[PDB]
């Protein structure tokens, strides 16, 4: 079955953080160094809230400038509306 063939070893598709996004993941609770996708954006969440970083007003807007969050992203702020951002830093920070 070559459904099979293809989808065998790539099924949960874990992956390594680098090391500044790994320091996130750990302040956020996280053990280990393998993850899959939805556990780093479950500890990334979990990172804003336990860090106060996001608007209490407006609590779509994260204010990450200055965290090491901020300079993973490469931004003073951004909205979870609007998260090309993340996107971005994650394509460049999980490996395989
Ligand atoms: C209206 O207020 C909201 C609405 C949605 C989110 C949110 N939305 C989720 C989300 C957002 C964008 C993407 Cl690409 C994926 C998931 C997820 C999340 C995951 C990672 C990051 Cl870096 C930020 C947020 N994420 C959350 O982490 N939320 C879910 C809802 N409540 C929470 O306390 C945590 C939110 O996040 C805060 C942490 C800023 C606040």
């Given at each position: ?72 992203l ?11 951002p ?11």
């Amino acid at each position: 079955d070559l459904e099979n063939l293809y989808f065998q070893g790539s099924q949960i598709n874990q992956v390594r953080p680098k090391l500044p996004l790994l320091k996130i993941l750990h302040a956020a609770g996280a053990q280990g160094e393998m993850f899959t996708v939805k556990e780093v954006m479950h500890y990334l969440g979990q990172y804003i809230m336990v860090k106060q970083l996001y608007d209490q007003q407006e609590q779509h807007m994260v204010y990450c400038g200055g965290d090491l969050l901020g300079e993973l992203l490469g931004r003073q702020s951004f909205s979870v509306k609007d998260p090309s951002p993340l996107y971005d830093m994650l394509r460049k920070n999980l490996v395989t």
